[PDB]
Amino acid sequence: VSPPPPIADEPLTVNTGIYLIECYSLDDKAETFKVNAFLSLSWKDRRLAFDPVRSGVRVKTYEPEAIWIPEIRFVNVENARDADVVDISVSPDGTVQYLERFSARVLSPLDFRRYPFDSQTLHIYLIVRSVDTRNIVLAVDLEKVGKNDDVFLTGWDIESFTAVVKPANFALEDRLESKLDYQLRISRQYFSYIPNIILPWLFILFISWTAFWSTSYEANVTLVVSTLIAHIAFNILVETNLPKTPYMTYTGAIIFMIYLFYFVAVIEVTVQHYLKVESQPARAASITRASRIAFPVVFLLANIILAFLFF
Amino acid sequence: VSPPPPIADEPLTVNTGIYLIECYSLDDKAETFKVNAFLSLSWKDRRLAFDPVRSGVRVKTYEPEAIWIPEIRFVNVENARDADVVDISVSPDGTVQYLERFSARVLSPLDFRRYPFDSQTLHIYLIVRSVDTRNIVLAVDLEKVGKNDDVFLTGWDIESFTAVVKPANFALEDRLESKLDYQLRISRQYFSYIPNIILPWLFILFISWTAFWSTSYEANVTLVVSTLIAHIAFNILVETNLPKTPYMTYTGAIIFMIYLFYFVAVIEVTVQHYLKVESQPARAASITRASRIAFPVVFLLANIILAFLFF
Amino acid sequence: VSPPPPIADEPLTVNTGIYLIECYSLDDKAETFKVNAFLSLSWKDRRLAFDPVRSGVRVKTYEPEAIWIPEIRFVNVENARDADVVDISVSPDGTVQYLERFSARVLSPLDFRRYPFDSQTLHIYLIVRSVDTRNIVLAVDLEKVGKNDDVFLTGWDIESFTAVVKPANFALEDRLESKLDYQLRISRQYFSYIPNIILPWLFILFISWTAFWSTSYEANVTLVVSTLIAHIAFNILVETNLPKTPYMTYTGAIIFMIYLFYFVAVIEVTVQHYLKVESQPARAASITRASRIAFPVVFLLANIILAFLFF
Amino acid sequence: VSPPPPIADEPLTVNTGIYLIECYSLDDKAETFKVNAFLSLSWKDRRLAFDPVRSGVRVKTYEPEAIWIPEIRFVNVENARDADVVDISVSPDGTVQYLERFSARVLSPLDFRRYPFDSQTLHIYLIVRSVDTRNIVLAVDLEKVGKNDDVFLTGWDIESFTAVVKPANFALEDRLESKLDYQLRISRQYFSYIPNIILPWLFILFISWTAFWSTSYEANVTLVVSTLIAHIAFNILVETNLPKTPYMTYTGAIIFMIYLFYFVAVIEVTVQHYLKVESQPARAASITRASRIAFPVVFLLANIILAFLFF
Amino acid sequence: VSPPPPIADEPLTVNTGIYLIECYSLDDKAETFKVNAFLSLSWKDRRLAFDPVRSGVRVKTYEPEAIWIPEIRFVNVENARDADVVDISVSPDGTVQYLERFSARVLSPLDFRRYPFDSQTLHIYLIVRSVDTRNIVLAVDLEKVGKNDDVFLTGWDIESFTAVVKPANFALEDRLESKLDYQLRISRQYFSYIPNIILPWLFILFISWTAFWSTSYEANVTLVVSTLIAHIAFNILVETNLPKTPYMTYTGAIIFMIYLFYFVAVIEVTVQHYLKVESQPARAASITRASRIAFPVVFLLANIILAFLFF
Ligand SMILES: CCCCCCCC(=O)OC[C@H](COP(=O)(O)OCC[N+](C)(C)C)OC(=O)CCCCCCC
Ligand SMILES: CCCCCCCC(=O)OC[C@H](COP(=O)(O)OCC[N+](C)(C)C)OC(=O)CCCCCCC
Ligand SMILES: CCCCCCCC(=O)OC[C@H](COP(=O)(O)OCC[N+](C)(C)C)OC(=O)CCCCCCC
Ligand SMILES: CCCCCCCC(=O)OC[C@H](COP(=O)(O)OCC[N+](C)(C)C)OC(=O)CCCCCCC
Ligand SMILES: CCCCCCCC(=O)OC[C@H](COP(=O)(O)OCC[N+](C)(C)C)OC(=O)CCCCCCC
Ligand SMILES: CCCCCCCCCCCC
Ligand SMILES: CCCCCCCCCCCC
Ligand SMILES: CCCCCCCCCCCC
Ligand SMILES: CCCCCCCCCCCC
Ligand SMILES: CCCCCCCCCCCC
Ligand SMILES: CCCCCCCCCCCC
Ligand SMILES: CCCCCCCCCCCC
Ligand SMILES: CCCCCCCCCCCC
Ligand SMILES: CCCCCCCCCCCC
Ligand SMILES: CCCCCCCCCCCC
Ligand SMILES: CCCCCCCCCCCC
Ligand SMILES: [Cl-]
Ligand SMILES: [Cl-]
Ligand SMILES: [Cl-]
Ligand SMILES: [Cl-]
Ligand SMILES: [Cl-]
Ligand SMILES: [Cl-]
Ligand SMILES: [Cl-]
Ligand code: NA
Ligand code: NA
Ligand code: NA
Ligand code: NA
Ligand code: NA
Ligand code: NA
């Protein structure tokens, strides 16, 4: 078994297609996702051509070892895919129709800049290395590219599964390589984040701001310092589901900003008490009254600036 | 080895059966469950027929490679099942009786809307792709569908294991596909949730309401703020065992509602103190006395509304 | 290769034996344990009989594929065992002596009712399905059932490894099945639980009871509320190592009872303060003095009732 | 392929040798370690002897299937080792020189009594079961026992890798078994424990003792109760990296002792307050002044007693 | 199949090359990284020489089993690599051009002394053991050493992937071994650490220093003790992502130093209160005023000393 020889000196076109059966385990920290799909391959092998009238059979079924099959691999995989050959069909002209069902863990990077209001473009890169006798080029058979309706990815909305029809043909270690880009467009379901993380986080922050309606330093210390512990808990809970990014994220910016607001609240609480002890509560009262308006206003304006910069 | 030819142009019926031996590892967050079961297959292959008289044997045993066996796969699996062929028996008329024992991780989504008082319908989808020569259709042999009495799923009550007898026959990549729906009905054992989560959660909430029988702002701050830390702990403990849902859950609604009640309690504690400092405790006392009745009543009524909406 | 034919119409007896080499990874939450052992099988195959005088050999060694070997499987396993055939020996009468070394993850449920003073009976179920030509029945060769001296299961004391000699012979999917019960008796090492969990838990509970020797509401609130946070930490630490049970456990009952005692302590602390503020400390003093005796007495009596109900 | 027959009656000596290439993943909780090493085997097979003159080759290379190779297994492994045969060489006299490269997870118990100032003796048990025709005995070829210089075990110092030259020959299921003990001596690197765990733990304990220089019950309660929460955190952090032992550990005793010191400190704080409320601060002052000396002295003496009992 | 014989007593040179396709999962605690790459091998085997005129092909393709292939292994791997042979090409002279695509978990130690501002030199060691008949030596084909542009390692910047061209030829167990060092230079992306860990950690430390502007012992105790709980949380969060090192790390030194600063702050808070109770606030005021300047100055100077010692 060797590659089919060229009629003239044209490269061998292998038509490809991926049909998603299952999409699961999207690990944000690891930037990986598991996929279970059909991989369809089609090429012309004139050595396998037959007469349909004399053979009496329209199609001829073959075992993988019986014929030449192109070595198609995935670029962005952890380990080589687990494949099960479903069917091999040969038409009278020698056109081969290969079909396998595979499962693979795909390495595809994510952009956390807009998290949890982010959309991602997941990639599946198909590749073929050219042999010495002839060069192999990949193609997209749009009729064999898709996903089943039941394909669900927990916490995500699946937009589209398409392929960039033009392959990236490049030289690697003195041989030609034909690469195809299969793109899975997904957008994060941000609903849950509001009553589970966003609203409870704002509530604990508003609790610290009740210290602006109190002169009791011991109670104010308790209010601001204790809610800071809850803020630290929410910060840790959020950052454990996210990887360390070399760029600032929308959530990252907000979290950092809340740390500043807590620090400024501690300063206010310290200043108010110092002036009270220094027998000048009229100065303390004016600062505290200003803080009641300043803190929510500056917080609301800063969040508008952040939302604008990130979206 | 190729599929058995048709007598007349009828499709090939493959009778199926699944008998559950072991049911384990129901991962709520991952929405997966592990299953160890018997898979029985039966089809007529006239090429394998024999005369029981001249053969001297009523049945003929074959090795998988010796005969044609239909390529049956599972739709909603992570990876292809781990199968061990138990027995292959051929009757004189050519009826084949296949039996294998498999283990597989099944991807089946869960509805957490009523958690932890929820019931689930787990699915196992059997499938067969039609070949060139003839079309393969699946069937349910009710006599070979079941589960053993010992089959236990930790934290769940197993109701029934049945199959939808009518297959979903559809075209996929220019070939016919026959799909069967095996349904495992289960209901969650909610007992443990009451003394472990529900009752302790209500106790910490009632402790915060003792601030309505105190005028001591420092003590009230301590009571409401510290019990909030415990509520955050319980919130985190519960949400780690649940996936992020694009819908509101019964538990989710309650958790969120408790965050509102804590926020309103902080407001009351802030108001009571402000009026006390403003030398008007008669106003503070009337608000605090009203809160003693209002807080449990509104909490009890809101929970009735939530139980009604979710159930 | 087919099963040995019967002399007269008796079933085929396969003598079994399991000898434990390694016992490890007892997962309480998962209710599973890993086992590495020898599996010995013995049956009579008269087709393999030979004369020892003319053959000059007392024993004949065979490869697995050369002869018929019964398909023995485990019922309560996650996946099919990882076996390595050690030896196959045939005696002159045709008695086959099979030996393999296997490793398997066993699914065996645990009774947490008396945890951590619980004992468990772990099970390993051996099974054989009867073939069409003849029926296969399992037996226990007591001389080939055991465990090595070094077999250690971390945090457990291994009592005995025995087998119920009488097999459970039953019909399943119109064929006979012979099941054997191998029982591994173990008891939990409860030593560590006393200085690590029990005594520190009682200490934090006793710290809350020091509030019955104080009139300072702010200090009492701090004492009872802060130790409740520690009580929650211990509750979470314990329940993470245990699965969700549909029955009440000994530890579960105690944990729940401590939550009641904390709630009653908050009520006492609230009542004592209210009466003091209401300018009647004589009533508060009598309640507080009674609580000093009542709380440890009721706690000690309730624990006696719980220990009696559970043991 | 069968074992080499004896010249006289003597057993077959298989010379063994393990050369460690990689040592990693020492799991304390699981009491396991991963090893990647060379396994060398040598035995005389006279059936393979050749004349170096007639053959023209001083050595003969064989494939595993071509010749008889003894079935050598590891006793204390989770699953059977993953082996790759490197070389098989036969000398003219028939001496076979086998070499394989393996990887295996080894089950070896640890003694936590002196943790984190503990040393361990890890074990690798080589074994061979005697066949029907002749008995196989293991031996140690000291020239082929070693480890490479780069072999590093994270958080441990590797002392020596030696083997007990005399095998443990015993009967198991009526056949002889020859066992060899390969010992890997390691000692824990306790450096990190001092500035990371020990010193910070003493600091939080000393902070609780500052309550002996204060008469403020509310501040004292805060000091002793809050540092207890930190002590609980450190207790949990330490015990999660350790398995549940049926014996007391050095660390375990200290941890338990600190819980006693916290309880006694709460008693002192309770007593001091009661006497001051009872209008007798002279009694309270004498107890508090004594506690300032008593607490560090009794703590220092008790630790000397513990270090003496454990080392 | 045996090694190619020498023309003139020279060793067999195997030209090697590694081309990285995917780099992922750099586990700091485990000191391992996963790699998916191309492994190219080239050696002369004159026994495979052919005349393209007689064979009708300029290059011959072979299956791995058909010809002799050198046994190349990796030194610092957990388990043997998962390899898929891509192509084997033989030119008329008998020069073999082998290509495989492998995936492997590599054991490479890291130096955490400068963490999180550290750079690492990851290693991949290629090795070949010499056979009886002739000695095998490794070489680096620089044209076949590289990495693709998309190769991304989460949280790291990939500097270079080069190989030490001169192999380390040494004797091991009576046979020659040729080792090659493939070096992957990486540097940690320290950006995220500043707003996520560094700045929030400094904020909680500055909050404790507000106790130097207060005379309220109860408030000061709350400020210093509560922020210590947050400092413990940050310490635990950081040390869980790092292994236990026998050397002091830059982060380790800082963490330890913060524990000292908290202890000294508790001493100051204790001293200030004692003098105030001893009716000498003039002494307490002078210490507290000095602490306001001393604490940030000594902290800033000590950090300069630490940064200097570590960088
Ligand atoms: C403390 C901060 C609170 C969070 C505030 C909400 C943040 C926000 O502005 O989210 C916007 C987001 C919609 O994202 P998209 O519209 O999908 O982003 C693409 C936008 N373009 C192409 C124009 C650049 O999602 C929404 O539509 C917002 C709905 C959630 C409202 C939450 C209220 C608390
Ligand atoms: C943490 C805050 C919890 C406070 C509320 C406590 C009561 C509680 O939650 O549980 C009620 C729940 C039963 O309600 P559901 O059966 O789940 O209602 C279904 C709605 N339909 C069927 C009409 C579509 O479950 C039960 O089994 C009720 C018994 C609970 C007993 C404990 C005291 C609540
Ligand atoms: C706050 C609660 C503290 C716990 C109190 C101890 C609980 C207790 O009584 O445990 C009993 C247990 C022995 O169990 P077993 O004897 O193994 O159970 C079999 C019992 N029968 C007779 C029915 C067949 O174990 C013992 O022997 C008890 C040893 C532990 C003592 C701990 C003291 C703090
Ligand atoms: C609160 C408890 C504080 C900890 C006190 C230190 C514990 C201690 O004494 O450790 C001793 C240990 C050395 O152990 P080894 O010498 O390795 O054990 C063998 C001992 N023989 C053979 C003689 C019986 O290690 C040492 O050499 C001591 C180094 C640690 C110093 C810690 C200072 C805080
Ligand atoms: C409480 C402690 C605060 C942390 C202080 C910052 C630590 C620091 O100085 O980090 C230096 C680091 C750059 O290191 P490198 O230049 O990459 O290391 C090589 C240096 N030589 C070869 C000269 C020895 O990284 C930087 O360039 C520093 C950027 C981070 C600034 C953080 C401000 C909060
Ligand atoms: C408390 C924060 C409320 C702010 C809500 C902003 C929602 C923006 C939606 C923009 C859709 C394009
Ligand atoms: C005061 C800081 C407490 C931080 C607690 C974080 C809890 C994280 C749990 C994450 C489980 C997935
Ligand atoms: C306010 C601090 C809340 C911390 C809660 C931590 C809960 C972690 C649960 C982990 C279970 C796996
Ligand atoms: C159909 C069964 C409904 C049972 C409802 C029980 C509700 C109990 C609420 C108690 C709240 C503390
Ligand atoms: C502090 C609680 C002490 C209770 C000890 C009970 C021990 C029961 C032993 C029963 C053995 C049969
Ligand atoms: C008073 C604050 C208590 C915070 C305890 C947090 C515990 C976090 C556990 C996280 C386990 C991963
Ligand atoms: C209210 C604070 C509760 C803290 C819970 C700590 C749980 C730690 C679990 C650690 C599991 C390894
Ligand atoms: C703060 C505790 C310091 C105790 C140090 C003990 C060091 C013992 C060294 C023993 C070497 C054999
Ligand atoms: C009361 C505070 C308990 C804190 C327990 C913290 C547990 C941390 C475990 C982290 C494992 C990675
Ligand atoms: C608050 C700490 C600020 C210190 C920043 C130091 C940055 C040093 C940069 C050195 C680059 C070589
Ligand atoms: C009282 C201090 C509690 C500190 C707990 C820190 C928990 C960190 C958990 C991080 C899990 C990735
Ligand atoms: Cl692949
Ligand atoms: Cl499948
Ligand atoms: Cl099995
Ligand atoms: Cl082994
Ligand atoms: Cl013996
Ligand atoms: Cl023997
Ligand atoms: Cl390798
Ligand atoms: Na092929
Ligand atoms: Na077949
Ligand atoms: Na067989
Ligand atoms: Na307080
Ligand atoms: Na062999
Ligand atoms: Na080869």
Side-chain angles (χ1 to χ4, degrees), chain B residues 10-58:
Chain B
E10 71 280 2
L12 178 71
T13 287
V14 173
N15 290 279
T16 71
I18 297 170
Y19 185 91
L20 317 173
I21 299 148
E22 289 300 323
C23 292
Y24 56 112
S25 303
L26 194 150
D27 199 323
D28 291 291
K29 229 184 161 69
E31 281 159 81
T32 59
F33 73 96
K34 294 195 213 276
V35 74
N36 192 300
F38 268 149
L39 171 72
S40 77
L41 303 170
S42 186
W43 66 97
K44 181 119 88 173
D45 192 341
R46 248 165 283 265
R47 299 170 298 160
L48 305 173
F50 58 93
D51 185 49
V53 181
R54 290 184 185 175
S55 302
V57 285
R58 293 181 183 175

Side-chain angles (χ1 to χ4, degrees), chain D residues 100-113:
Chain D
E100 65 158 67
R101 197 186 157 170
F102 73 94
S103 56
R105 191 162 182 225
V106 191
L107 187 155
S108 211
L110 314 165
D111 185 9
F112 292 97
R113 256 164 281 248

Side-chain angles (χ1 to χ4, degrees), chain B residues 138-156:
Chain B
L138 291 183
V140 175
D141 187 343
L142 296 158
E143 215 96 288
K144 274 167 160 65
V145 178
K147 68 198 178 75
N148 99 82
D149 310 315
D150 313 308
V151 172
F152 81 102
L153 188 62
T154 309
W156 297 87

